[PDB]
């Protein structure tokens, strides 16, 4: 049930940074990426997602212009929210 503008997996950037819609269907434990046990990690709670962008699970996120990814998502660039 993506919309029109998801961020696909064939999308070059997305492919790069290990993204996916489903933070249970990723990579992040073997990233460890700091901020945050792994585990807790998704777009949710990451500094790059715009929640005034996309309506519902589909939000905007900085690194991808133009496009929207699930907030129960994850990708390798994740950074913990504290604005
Ligand atoms: S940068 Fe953050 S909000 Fe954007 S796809 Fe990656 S984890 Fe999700």
Redesign the pocket.
């Known amino acids: 049930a993506a919309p029109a503008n998801a ?1 696909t997996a064939d999308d070059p950037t997305a492919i790069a ?1 290990k ?1 996916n819609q489903d933070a249970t269907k990723s990579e992040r434990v073997a990233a460890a990426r700091p901020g945050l046990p792994p585990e807790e ?3 949710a709670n ?4 715009q929640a005034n962008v996309g309506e519902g699970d589909w ?1 905007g ?4 212009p133009g496009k929207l ?1 699930n907030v129960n ?7 913990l929210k504290a604005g």
Not at 61 to 64: A, H, I, N, T, Y
Not at 73 to 79: D, I, N, Q, V, Y
């Open positions: 961020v940074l993204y990690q998704h777009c990451c500094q790059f997602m939000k996120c900085q690194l991808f990814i998502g994850w990708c390798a660039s994740w950074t």
